[PDB]
Each structure stands twice: as structure tokens, then as C-alpha cells.
Amino acid sequence: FLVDTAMPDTVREACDRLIQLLLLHLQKLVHHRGPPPRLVPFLDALKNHVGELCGETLRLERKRFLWQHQLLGLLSVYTRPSCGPEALGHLLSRARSPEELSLATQLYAGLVVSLSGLLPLAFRSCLARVHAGTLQPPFTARFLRNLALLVGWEQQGGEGPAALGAHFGESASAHLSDLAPLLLHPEEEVAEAAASLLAICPFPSEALSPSQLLGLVRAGVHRFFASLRLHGPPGVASACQLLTRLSQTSPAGLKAVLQLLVEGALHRGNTELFGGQVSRNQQEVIYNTQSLLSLLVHCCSAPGCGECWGAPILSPEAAKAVAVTLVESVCPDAAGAELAWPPEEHARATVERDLRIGRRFREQPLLFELLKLVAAAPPALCYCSVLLRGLLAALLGHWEASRHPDTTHSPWHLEASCTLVAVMAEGSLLPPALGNMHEVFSQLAPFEVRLLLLSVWGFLREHGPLPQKFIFQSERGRFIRDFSREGGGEGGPHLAVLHSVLHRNIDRLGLFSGRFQAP
């Protein structure tokens, strides 16, 4: 009444003067004689209405926010239970504007000069409301986004956060394990607001616990997957940032992030986004693939101009982890896990496993993409030698069973042979002379390409995809496979079959002779 009747103008100025005098007298009574503390029954009834008082302050009316915000500060300093964090939490969960949020920072400044630990208590009050039925999910997402606003506002620290000393990011840094269940929160507003907070909220300065890291990564990959199913390529940013930052916490964090992402992606769920079998648009699949390949390369690249045209080097350890999780997901038995290649007579012994690998490749086109990502790091493709040999054997068997006079009647097998050869050559498991062989696959009958893939198998038998053949070139920081130093690494006897195939089909392969020259 008095506030509404401070805005007969003699009564209105009497009430404005009255509210000024009342605020200043309450300031006197709240905190004086610093002997029991002074008791304000007026404020003793206001602790029952501190939330309503905050609501009337967030109204931010001409002078009502000044008077009522001063009164909330005096209530906070007065109430021995210190409703200041309670007021701050209600503000954070019910402020709708950066000025409504500015009310919280002004309150904290008016309170941090007299009170301590206000924001952590406000945060825990809000979150306790959140995970209960309290602070209904609109209010929950409001508090989540407002705490994200606070954390960022401190993180873009100027005079505001510094004089405030809020430590919004640091204060929220201890509440990581409550926002992760909010990543699993059914309300997508709550889920993505927690995603945004955790993406920007700094991780504990000491470390992230195996439980902390595992739950945070589980919730971050869950947010990534739900938002990629639901929102598409543009909607995974907060989950991606949270996951990448979790990856930069430790190598354990990196490998956990990548492996949860892989298991969820190669899960029977979250697979229609990526061309996986059991009609979908091809553009959306292509650009979802671009999305998680961007996340993968961001997590895999070594952080930290190296010329304006160069690119960061993918870590061989991260690509090795990608290779091993690929092998576990596609070929789990790993009865022939040894990297070097066995005799081709062993192919008929493992027909079932290699056909299963081929069927898995056919159902999921994303497997080739991860093969190329692994082959980006030179030594990592050595660990994919089992998958490479299985795909090569499946292609060889299909070309054995291919009765067509040409190879265009089997598009999937032709492209699988071409892409397998491209992956193997890209990982420097094959010489460039024997790596240009996939280009002439389409102009060949099935038995020529079968003999060519048998030559690939023979070369990978003689040399073998072994990491120790890769000498780490410290000048550029990338492992280099020197086939010249290996001895016959340019395909001495293996290029003979390719050249014979070129000679036999010289009427069609004449213009491609430049791709198979010795130098």
C-alpha cells in the first residue's frame, strides 16, 4: 500500500518521503550495534514474503524496484536465516531480463558487502527446487539459463564481475553433477539450458571424478544425441562444447567422451540420422555426419600460427581410440586381432565373420567415414587391419561369386573396394603406385579387381599394417610411413598384376597409365 501510494500528491510525497525514511530506518535497525541483534517484526513478516517481495522487485517499476530492492537487501542482512541467497535464487529462477538479472547482481553487491557465499546458496536452493516438483520446469530452465548468463557474464569478466567478485563460473563449477541429470531432464528447455550451462561452466579446478566425468559425459552425449535427433546439426552446440571440454579435462575424459559418443551413435538408436539401415533425406544425413565429424575432429585435434593455410594434427592416440572402438563395434570377436596380414587361404576359414563385417558396412555407411578419420592419423589405421582384411575378403568373395561381365551391376561392392583401397592408401598402408588402383576399378571385370584386391592383400602380407614401421617425424609432428626404407615398399611384385591388368585392358585403361608409374 505505502509503495503503491507513494506513486493527493501531498500524500504521495508524504509516502515517498515515508518510504525513503522507512528504508533508511530499516537500514539502521537491520544492522547496527556491531548485544543481541535488532529485531524487526516488519521484516519478520517479510521473510514469509521475501519471494513475493522479489516478485514485486522484478516488476522493476519506476521507483518500486529501488525501494523494494533496498528492502530485500535489508531483509537479507536482517534475517539471521539470511534470505539473501533465497532472494537471489528466486530472482535467478524468475528474472526474465538481463536487467531483471541485474537486480540479482545489484542485490548480491548490496549483500556481498555484508554477506558471504550468497550465490552458492542461491544456486543450491534453486537446484533443490528444480530436481523436486518445485520450481516448475519453466522456472527451472529460467534459473538454468540465468545461471548460464551469470557464469558467462563473469567469464567475459570486466568491471562488473570483478567488483562484484561473484565467481559465477566457479560457483556453478561445483554444481556440475546436478545439471547432468537436467541433461536427462525430459523438458527440453531444462535439458538444453543445463547443456548450455555445463558447456560453459568451468570444470572443477582439481579434476573430474570417474563418476563426475562419466555422468557428465553420459548426460552430454545424451544431450548431443537427443538434440541431433530433435534439433539437427545446429542444435548440439552445448552438448558438443560440454563433451569437448570434458575431453580436455584428461585423456580419460577424451576417450570417455569419444567412446560414449561412438556407442550411442552406433547404437540401434540414433542411427537413422546417419544413413543407417533400420526413407530418409540424404542432405540431412550428410550434414548430421558433418556435425559429429566436426565434433570428433575438434576433440581429436591437438589443441594449439603454423602458417595461415595449415591445419592442426589429429592426435594418433585419439584416432587409435576411434579405431579400437570401431573394431569393437564392428568385429567384436577379434579372433584374428593381430595387425599383420595372414595368408589369403585363411579367408575361407572365417567366411561368416567377414560376411558379417561386410553386412555391417553395407547397413551403416558411416563406418567408412570413421575409417577415413582413423586413416587421417597414419599409425591409427594399423589398428583397423582386422576390419580392412575383413572388408577385403568380403569384396574378394563377392567378386569370386560375381558372374556379371562388368562391375557396374554391383555398385555397393565396387564402391566398397574403391573406398577400402582409398582408406588403406590414405593411412599409408599402401604405396601411391598401388594406391591409385581404386580409380580403375569401375572399368574392370570382377576377376581383374579380385586379382587387384588379392595384390593388396599380398602387399599387406609382405609389409603389414604395423605402427612400428611409422617413424614419428618430429619436424612436423606427424608419423611418416617410408615405403622406400621398408624395402620393396613401392610394390615390386605387387604392381606386376596391376600392370598386366592395364596391358590386357589397354583399349580402356590407356589414359590411366599415369596413376601407376613407379615414381
Partner 1 sequence: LRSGNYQEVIQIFIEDNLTLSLPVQFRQSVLRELFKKAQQGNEALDEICFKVCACNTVRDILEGRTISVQFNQLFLRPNKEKIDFLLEVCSRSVNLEKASESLKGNMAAFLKNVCLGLEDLQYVFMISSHELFITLLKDEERKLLVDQMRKRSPRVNLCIKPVTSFYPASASVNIGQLEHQLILSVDPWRIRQILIELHGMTSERQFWTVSNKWEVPSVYSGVILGIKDNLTRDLVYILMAKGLHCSTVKDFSHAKQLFAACLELVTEFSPKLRQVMLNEMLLLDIHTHEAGTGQAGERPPSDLISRVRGYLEMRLPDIPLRQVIAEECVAFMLNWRENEYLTLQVPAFLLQSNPYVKLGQLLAATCKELPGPKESRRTAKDLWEVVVQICSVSSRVSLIKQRESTLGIMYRSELLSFIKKLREPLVLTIILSLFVKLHNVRDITAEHISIWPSSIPNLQSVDFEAVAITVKELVRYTLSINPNNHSWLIIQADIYFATNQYSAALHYYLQAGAVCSDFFNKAVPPDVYTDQVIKRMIKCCSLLNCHTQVAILCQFLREIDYKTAFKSLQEQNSHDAMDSYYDYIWDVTILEYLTYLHHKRGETDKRQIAIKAIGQTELNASNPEEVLQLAAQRRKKKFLQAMAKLYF
Which residues between 215 and 254 bind partner 1 (CB under 8 A)? 215, 233-234, 237, 250-252
- Contact window for partner 1 (CB under 8 A) among 19-27, 120-128, 383-391, 456-464: 19-27
Q: How far apart are CA 483 and CA 489, in angstroms?
A: 4
Binding mask 378-417 for partner 1 (x = CB under 8 A): ----------------------------------------
Per-residue binding letters, 278-307, with partner 1 (x by CB under 8 A): ----xx--xx-xxx-xx--xx--x---xxx
Distance CA(61)–CA(19), nearest Å, equals 15
Per-residue cell: 245: 571440454
Residue 426 is a binding residue for partner 1 (CB under 8 A): yes
Residue 117 interacts with partner 1 (CB under 8 A): yes or no: yes
| Cα–Cα dist 420/439, whole Å | 12
Report the 10 Å Cβ neighbour count for 351: 12
Q: Which of 136, 209, 277, 408 binds partner 1 (CB under 8 A)?
A: 209
Answer yes or no whether residue 55 interacts with partner 1 by CB under 8 A: no
Stretch that binds partner 1, among 387-395, 404-412, 473-481, 501-509 (CB under 8 A): 473-481
Given a contact cutoff of 8 angstroms between Cβ atoms, the answer to whether 245 and 255 are in contact is: no
Bridge partners, residue 470, by sequence: 481
Asked if 115 is part of the footprint of partner 1 (rule: CB under 8 A), the reply reads yes
Count of residues in contact with partner 1, rule CB under 8 A? 122
CA dihedral for 395, 397, 399, 402, sign (positive or negative)? negative
**Binders of partner 1 in range 70-89 (CB under 8 A):** 70, 73, 77
291 to each of 224, 294, 323, 447, 478, how far by Cα in Å?
A: 10, 5, 19, 39, 25
**Cell numbers describing residue 256:** 570417455
CB under 8 A: which stretch of 121-129, 146-154, 449-457, 490-498 binds partner 1? 146-154
Q: Rule CB under 8 A: is residue 474 a binding residue for partner 1?
A: no
Q: Are 188 and 225 in contact (CB under 8 A)?
A: no
The distance of closest approach from Cβ of residue 61 to partner 1 in the complex, given in angstroms and rounded to an integer, is 12
Q: Taking the complex as a whole, how short is the minimal distance between the CB of residue 376 and partner 1, in angstroms? A: 6
Do residues 272 and 280 lie in contact, with contact meaning Cβ atoms separated by under 8 Å?
A: yes
334 makes contact with partner 1 (CB under 8 A): yes
> Whole-number minimum distance, CB 97 to partner 1, in Å?
11
Residue pair 132/95 in contact (Cβ under 8 Å)? The answer is no
Using CB under 8 A as the binding rule, whether residue 362 contacts partner 1 is answered as no
Please enumerate in sequence order all residues whose Cβ is within 8 A of that of 235, keeping only pairs 6 or more positions apart, or say none: 192, 227, 228
Please pick, from the candidates 7, 44, 52, 116, the single residue that binds partner 1 as defined by CB under 8 A: 116
